[PDB]
Amino acid sequence: VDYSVWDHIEVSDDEDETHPNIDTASLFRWRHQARVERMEQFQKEKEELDRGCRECKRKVAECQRKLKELEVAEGGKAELERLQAEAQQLRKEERSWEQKLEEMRKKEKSMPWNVDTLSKDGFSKSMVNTKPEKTEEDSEEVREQKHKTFVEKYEKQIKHFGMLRRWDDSQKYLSDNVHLVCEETANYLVIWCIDLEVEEKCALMEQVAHQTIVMQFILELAKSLKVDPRACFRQFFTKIKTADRQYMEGFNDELEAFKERVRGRAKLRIEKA
Amino acid sequence: LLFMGYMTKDNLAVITQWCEGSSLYKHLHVQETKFQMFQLIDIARQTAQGMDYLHAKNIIHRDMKSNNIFLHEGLTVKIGDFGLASVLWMAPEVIRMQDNNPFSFQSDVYSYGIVLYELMTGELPYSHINNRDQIIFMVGRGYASPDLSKLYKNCPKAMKRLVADCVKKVKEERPLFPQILSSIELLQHSLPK
Amino acid sequence: EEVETFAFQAEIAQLMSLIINTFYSNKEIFLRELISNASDALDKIRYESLTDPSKLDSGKELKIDIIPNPQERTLTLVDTGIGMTKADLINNLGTIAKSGTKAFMEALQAGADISMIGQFGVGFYSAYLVAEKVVVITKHNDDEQYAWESSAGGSFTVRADHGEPIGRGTKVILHLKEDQTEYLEERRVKEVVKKHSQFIGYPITLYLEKEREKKKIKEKYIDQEELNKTKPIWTRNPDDITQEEYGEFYKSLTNDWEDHLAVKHFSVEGQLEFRALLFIPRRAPFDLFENKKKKNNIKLYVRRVFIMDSCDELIPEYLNFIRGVVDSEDLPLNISREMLQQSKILKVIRKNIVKKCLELFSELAEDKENYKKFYEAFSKNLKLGIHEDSTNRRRLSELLRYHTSQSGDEMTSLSEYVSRMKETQKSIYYITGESKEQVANSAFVERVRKRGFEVVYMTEPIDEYCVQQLKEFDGKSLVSVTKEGLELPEDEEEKKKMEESKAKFENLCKLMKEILDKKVEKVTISNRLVSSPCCIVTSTYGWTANMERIMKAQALRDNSTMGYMMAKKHLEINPDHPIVETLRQKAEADKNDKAVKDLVVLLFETALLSSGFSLEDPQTHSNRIYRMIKLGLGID
Amino acid sequence: EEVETFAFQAEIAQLMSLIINTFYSNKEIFLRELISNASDALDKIRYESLTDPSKLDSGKELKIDIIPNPQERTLTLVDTGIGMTKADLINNLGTIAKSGTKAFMEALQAGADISMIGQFGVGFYSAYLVAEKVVVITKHNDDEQYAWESSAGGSFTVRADHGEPIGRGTKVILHLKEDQTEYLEERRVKEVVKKHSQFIGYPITLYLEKEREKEISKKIKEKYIDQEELNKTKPIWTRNPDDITQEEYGEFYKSLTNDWEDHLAVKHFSVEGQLEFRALLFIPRRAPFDLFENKKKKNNIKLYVRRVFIMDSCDELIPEYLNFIRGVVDSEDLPLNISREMLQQSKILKVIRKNIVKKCLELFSELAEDKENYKKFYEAFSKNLKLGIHEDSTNRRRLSELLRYHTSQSGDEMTSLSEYVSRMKETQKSIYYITGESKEQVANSAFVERVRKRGFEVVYMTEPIDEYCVQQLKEFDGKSLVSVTKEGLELPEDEEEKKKMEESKAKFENLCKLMKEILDKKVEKVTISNRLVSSPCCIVTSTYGWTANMERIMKAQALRDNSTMGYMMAKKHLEINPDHPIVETLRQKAEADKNDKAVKDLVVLLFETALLSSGFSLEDPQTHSNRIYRMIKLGLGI
């Protein structure tokens, strides 16, 4: 409702405020040193004001004490009258020093903010994550169990990708559920496309095969970039949209080669059975 | 087969949003790169506006000279003081140290005027005297002023009055930047003449 | 005189028009505002419970439910907050620019243990940005159920609810217009709540019909809790948080399952107060320096509510790899609560964040292998910061690591180099090159490696920019071995050699200047080579051959002033090499010999290749090479 | 049933607090608001003049005056506008969201000829950002003047105004806060007016006293000076492009972007409909040195709505490669923010940018009709044009025709792709280009001799941006670009040369395999083809991998990922000229036996020289230098 305390801030290394003909690197110094020297003068004024306050307080304290002592002792009436005027002068000095104090307070109110006065440090704690690294590739142990768990839990998603044809929709839908991006997914896609051609569904095999071929180059390019495929798959369809003619023919020929391999493997499986 | 994959177009973006450039310095009078009226008037105008900028921000330079002035290939002068790289470039108020803080706007204008004199003469002020022991004496007395017999020929005479009234020691009548912009404006109008 | 004191009025119809149309620039913040209001209601009712638990005898759970419905084109937002009575239903939701949250907070001033979001009093009316009419059903513990309803016409109808009762809280139904039907999809609302109000302090629950029932049935509603799954970690005190919680938070923040290298947690207090959390990614993004990614790293939060993402005033560009969340208690916000009314508070936040980041980097230095990984990831950002921040260049300077002569293939800081530097020298010797082996053995390093001096290798083009500002270190100037006038601790025998060689080797050097007058502007003798006879050094002012190459091969570089900063080359002949001695012997016989100058030009071209310069016309070098090989094999 | 209708109300104090606090990010725009309102009053009175000129007896000029008074610390703003009566004073300046300008617009009476900048009714209260107490003095034609006054305390007073009289219009007085005193100085008001209200039709005249009075035959510096330098620029885009001459455009350009000379070319168009704006675009003669310094906070195109500044150029206003275009874009009816600093519907910028891009591309195409001016434009903006080729995927076809290069027969002048196509032989079906580092570097090279001897024209491309451009450009008028640096170059071939190549393979396959073994890792393939005449060996790159120039350009990039380059190598393929006597002189030497140190030495030397002549850079030049040095030693006799 009110923002009257955040209307005066002086940042020293203000990147946006500068001059084209003034060295920004060196301009950031005369602003900083000016801020520091202004703060130092302000602190000096504070400290001298405070000693002045206590010294005039002790002045008036001993002055009242001496006034009482002179009043108690007889014969010091003339000295008491002189101390009356001296005391009044001391009160004038004290009330003037309090005036200096409230003017100093007003100056501090008018003092623009800075990084050092806006906030003071609270607590900082730096933690360095020391955790084991590297991965393993094998057909057993956690990897096979990972295959089984992921195929059992997310059969619907991988099947719906198997029944997909559009690139942009595939990109968006995986971007919603990027967890599907993994080597195990590609392995099961290949195996179950093999199974589909074992069932002899040629059109369904091709529809599944294009989609299965999609992530093979994604995995290859992820290996090339040394970044997990979950972090580089989104751009792949941007590349295939802006793909050169040779990339188109390469995608087509890999698709055809994988189709022929799948057909041959399914024929061998049928003959064996 | 798996083939090679081609792919390409990974990060072939034009990441060249950066900059690099610097001419050299401004200490060309020793280098002896004498220039004409146009360049010196332009440099004086640009340094004037630059120093007025800090004068407005209440930032006092005081120690600004040929070694704290930087030229650049964009035909711009970065008067931004380098920080490290002297004598003979001060004012008598600084030398006497009457208040131990000569740091005032009039002192900065005095420094501006004497660097203008140095550049428009192409020579270091008080070149005839090269001994610090006597140089400190003169500036401690603060009476004499440099002559203007080594002016560069064929230029508007207005900056001769500008430097002459910039170097007088009376700080109360020393010219200030609000009229200094007018001075350089009439200088650049007087450039063709 | 006459004085007529009045009171300011407000045209309510025009005020509603302003709020609905020209007040908020993004129509999808209405959901954020409603979630904020529901969080305020929940905070109020939960605060009232600690004084007397009997308050919560209308439903113990505190939650927010979002119930889109495309069968009615309505989106329902139900919470179990405090609700609001008839007087509240009039004042709060009928008086524009009046907040019951502010009234509630300013009332206590002793139970300030809570911080509820809202001080303006117009946030609810942003609901009309997507819906023509809104009906509000609430039930306070003190009053009965009421049905607030309006269509932003200037009047609202309040009646006792004649429908299904609720235990407590509020029930906002948004009869959306046909233009905002995209807000009824799971993905859209999920995106909105994840972007703006995913860190609210209360569970947020969706409710959609997508559950397949076993086989043709799909009428089960999805009780999808995952809108506020991740909870604000920086709120909890760090001494109670291990690396596991930080790791889970970072993994959920990046939407990618990878760990984080290090985590910095700190806060400041005073007039400005913020609890900031900064993470160093384990690896670098593949598009860290792609400009199309703009700056989407550090997010500003106010009371666990998002305001603005990474801005150039929030964190400097070279420090855009470090990603985290910044949350503050008090800040001045725009009416839309999307920008700050004071620009320079962002700059102050940046000033503190940069200092804390540099302290984190300095802390990382102690761990050898971890700092090795961090350097191999972000040395480019470190050197870019050295170039950019003149104020922090000093702090970034000691974070550098380089291959050196005496370190094999391990990187050592400048502090280690100055530690191991011989007292006889006062300069840091560095070489700016292109490859590891290209600088490992080169004509400029022979003498230095012979005398035991160590030189710092700089194989990346980023150092070529960095070194222009890193002109000194610890009071010692940095000088390159590829520049003219290399200073070297000299010996009396060495200077005697030099002075006799200048007189002895004047004829052939002036001969080189005569034959090569427009290509080489100085030929002299110095101490740089042992096993090589010629090298091309650059003047002290100009561009190193590598520097010139980098400038020439930049994509967007102006060529008009490129010719200004051409390096002025300097041939350097190693007198101890037999080639130059025999050449001088041949020249002494005659200065007009064909072979003498056609060998001089070949030597100059080969040295130019050895010095990293690019040949103006390599075809001349190639064709002279084949002509000389023809005469070598004697086939004319 | 039990319905009970109420009426919406408001909290006036809180609403004032919101208006003062949470709308305007910059405290300086109070000046913009007040000047806009004064211009609104001037527009109202000017329109009323067209129906009745007898209501202008009190004041005839239409002027806006600012008179800072630092001694009193008040910044007045006088105007001879329409003024306000008692009812208008208490309604418009007393009611939030009540804007009498909108109501006046409603009473247009089939006379829609003026553009009235006011819709909200909150603009006036911006003065409380910097002023603690606002005093307003207005005088209508048919009413006595009244002295409106407030301090945003929720209550305002109206006075009979027995003070100084004014003929017409209003006079707002801002009693600035004790700290917001920086807005009295000439510099700040000048900057604010130039930034926001520089294009107001009515003359805004700043007033200040710093004149040095003449003294001749003392030291007087107190004399109010009238300045109109802050409104000298006049909107010309509001006129038709037919009656404006070139010198007017040049004057406006030098007054707009401060450039010494005039413009190179101008575009002045407008589109009418649901989205109406008049766009004026210039082309600077010389591009600034920091044009591509992208940390400059782009401000080239200034979006004006109803002659007042709204926002600087954003990424969506104009594409990056057109950042050199200087000018203004002024519209009439766009939804503004409550702060009047941006547009509510930001998706309309996606239409403005499309229209501007299309019209500026049409401007560029039309400008390519006079040789001298187009050459001057190209010399300074070829980098931008090729950047556009690289970036835009919708104007690439249109943008391609505006590209110039040196060719094999273009001499020292640049010629277009269309002209080369016109001079293209029917036997060839490709465009031949070379990507090197210099004109002379590619003028004579191992890849061009054979082609230049035959009947094809080659296109020289030397600037580093050319490679970025040509990676996106894949065809031109149905003719595909082919680089001479890349392997598998296709030329029209007769049967005689065909069988000559067949015998050449049958004779040199042993060479191919043997120096393939010699260059085990340094070279992938060794073959022979018609690319060389007087050069024995050249090395070409792969079909999709980066060429040598692209490799060098990427390895020179300051901010690049040194993990992606490693697999994106150039598959170097050595190519031999079988007619050169060198490659057959060692043919017999290797035929006698496979293992000879001499043949390996010459093979390595030739490979290194071809690498240097192919534009590649040596991994370690010291080895080449040392072997050259030893060879010179042996030749000289030492």
Ligand SMILES: Nc1ncnc2c1ncn2[C@@H]1O[C@H](COP(=O)(O)OP(=O)(O)OP(=O)(O)O)[C@@H](O)[C@H]1O
């Ligand atoms: N669901 C709700 N439950 C309880 N109180 C509510 C609810 N929605 C609105 N209110 C009341 O309405 C008042 C004003 O509503 P509004 O959301 O506009 O203000 P606000 O919460 O202060 O937010 P803002 O600061 O964004 O304007 C609030 O202070 C609150 O008391």
Ligand SMILES: Nc1ncnc2c1ncn2[C@@H]1O[C@H](COP(=O)(O)OP(=O)(O)OP(=O)(O)O)[C@@H](O)[C@H]1O
């Ligand atoms: N200086 C002035 N001269 C004449 N009329 C004025 C002046 N200042 C305000 N008004 C009157 O005040 C009313 C509008 O005031 P205000 O500036 O707050 O609104 P607005 O300009 O329509 O809104 P906004 O600028 O926020 O779009 C109109 O009746 C207008 O004539």
